[PDB]
Design a protein around this ligand. Structure first.
Ligand SMILES: COc1ccc(CN2[C@@H]3C[C@H]2CN(c2ccc(-c4cc(OCC(C)(C)O)cn5ncc(C#N)c45)cn2)C3)cn1
Ligand SMILES: COc1ccc(CN2[C@@H]3C[C@H]2CN(c2ccc(-c4cc(OCC(C)(C)O)cn5ncc(C#N)c45)cn2)C3)cn1
Lengths: 291, 288
């Protein structure tokens, strides 16, 4: 079947560029864990012709993994090979010759954007009750970096499908990296959380760059609320009809008119009425120079 | 939605979490005036988490639709659902000992344990009986033209009097036409419980449920061990194709092992049917 073919292709030595010798990989602490998959920190010796040990993250399956897990991981590997951008997580390679399949990716010292934000406070060698302080300028900065990454992906004819604050990684110098390409595809029951999905994805199962834009609007909302939970107290099952009848999230606190207007436009019912990612970057670039 | 199954939300009180995984959760609950029982009845409630995808929603709805049609002493009882004024809540039977996997693993550290009268005291006779109750439930399920697809010790619940209840019907499918269920895309059943033709061919029949039953059997007689110990899921493709199967575990009889092996025949025709699995277990029991 399609998976046994990919598995077998993967387990052969066909891509010497991406194969990393297993003996050169030393696995450390767990960075995150779900039921069937795990991410650990690691050091990699002589990775990609680099001197000494490079700090990396390793993605791997757990023992109760289903074929849909195996598929997601292999599919991410195949997408990340074709991709190169400062705001997209970097793939270093894979170990396919010695035990479990391991994906080796760039290590993001702050972890997920969602985590980063909830540990922060909004403002206008000591110590504080919060990890850091963030201005609207930082938040606009974060959104712009993601929109750049997304513009690159849309130009590459790739639909991410799972855009959300938990899938953006925060690297050294607070650089945003789009991550989790398990569900991406080159442009039936979906595995994207309902609350981030575009109306046409929910009703017609259609996924395009414009449905990525809708998801981007939910992420913006997540950013300006510093890690809020979208549609709080509304059951995911109730959301279809609220959206169909034209309900949207209200303007959050500490959110400006111009910022909220951009969110709303991302959530237009007709995908043609939504901004493209270039328009989005433009809006953020303008906000920035204008303080 | 359905008159015979819709239950008044105000009559349902939710308690502690009994289990939660990726985007779904089970809570202990109590229901007032349930199916005309006086007073409160202790129940369990299955529901979605905030980050649910359409797949999880469709799975909860499909489990509801299946449990509506099936009634058997060894299949989890559905009481009803709250599906109107908010979140979808599935109301099912509460099983006091929890999952079979959990129950058997507990018997490793909780006396009297496995002995080779008390609820916690287990002999091989008790284990054969557990397997048999499950097989009778599966036999009925197969007669009702269903494939469970996700038969495993984690999906069997242990109720009052140590009765087995097949549960977790989210993935089960109708096979009235063709006697097979096939989908184009990848399944969500753990690789290690999947039949060889489910793995390579995306085909699910009662005979792939039989394969899964063999793995469950192995789980039972190892008292909740993990299948293909230390083998990566990805290695199962080549390993099953080349003819490797799990080894005979320690407190397993030759007849019991012969039954498992039969469940793991490459050719699905050569596997026993659930009716014949039940007969084999009946004979094992009475010859002791
Ligand atoms: C299908 O294959 C799968 C599926 C799921 C998984 C694991 N799942 C749960 C949710 C999803 C992904 N998960 C994580 C966990 C940690 C990280 C992560 C966390 C992290 O945190 C750093 C810190 C905050 C210092 O702990 C840094 N980095 N750097 C790179 C990555 C990556 N990738 C990370 C990213 N995703 C955890 C693995 N493989
Ligand atoms: C898609 O909809 C979903 C999907 C999955 C889930 C929850 N998932 C995780 C794995 C799967 C099913 N899960 C559970 C959790 C608890 C129980 C459970 C556990 C339980 O434990 C009793 C004890 C051990 C004394 O606490 C008793 N009962 N009785 C009925 C049920 C049911 N159902 C239970 C069964 N399945 C937890 C919820 N909704």
């Amino acid at each position: 079947g399609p998976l046994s073919l990919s598995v077998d292709a993967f387990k052969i030595l066909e891509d010497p560029k991406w194969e990393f010798p297993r003996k050169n990989l030393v696995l450390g602490k767990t960075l995150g864990e779900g039921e069937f998959g795990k991410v650990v920190k690691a050091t990699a010796f002589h990775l990609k012709g680099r001197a000494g040990y490079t700090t990396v993250a390793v993605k791997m399956l757990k023992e109760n993994a289903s074929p849909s897990e195996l598929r997601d991981l292999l599919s991410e590997f195949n997408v990340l090979k074709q991709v190169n951008h400062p705001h997209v997580i970097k793939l270093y390679g894979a170990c396919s010759q010695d035990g479990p399949l391991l994906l080796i990716v760039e290590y993001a010292k702050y972890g997920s954007l969602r985590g980063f934000l909830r540990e922060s406070r909004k403002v206008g060698s000591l110590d504080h009750p919060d990890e850091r302080a963030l201005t609207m300028g930082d938040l606009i900065s974060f959104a712009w970096q993601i929109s750049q990454g997304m513009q690159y992906l849309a130009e590459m004819k790739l639909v991410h499908r799972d855009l959300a604050a938990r899938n953006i990684l925060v690297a050294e110098g607070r650089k945003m990296k789009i991550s989790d390409f398990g569900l991406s595809r080159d442009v039936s029951q979906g595995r994207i959380p309902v609350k981030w999905m575009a109306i046409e994805s929910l009703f017609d199962h259609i996924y395009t760059t414009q449905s990525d834009v809708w998801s981007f609007g939910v992420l913006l909302w997540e950013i300006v609320t510093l890690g809020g939970n979208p549609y709080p107290g509304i059951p995911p099952e109730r959301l279809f009809n609220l959206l169909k009848t034209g309900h949207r999230m209200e303007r959050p606190d500490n959110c400006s008119e111009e910022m909220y207007r951009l969110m709303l436009q991302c959530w237009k019912q007709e995908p043609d009425k939504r901004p493209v990612f270039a328009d989005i970057s433009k809006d953020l670039e303008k906000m920035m120079v204008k303080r």
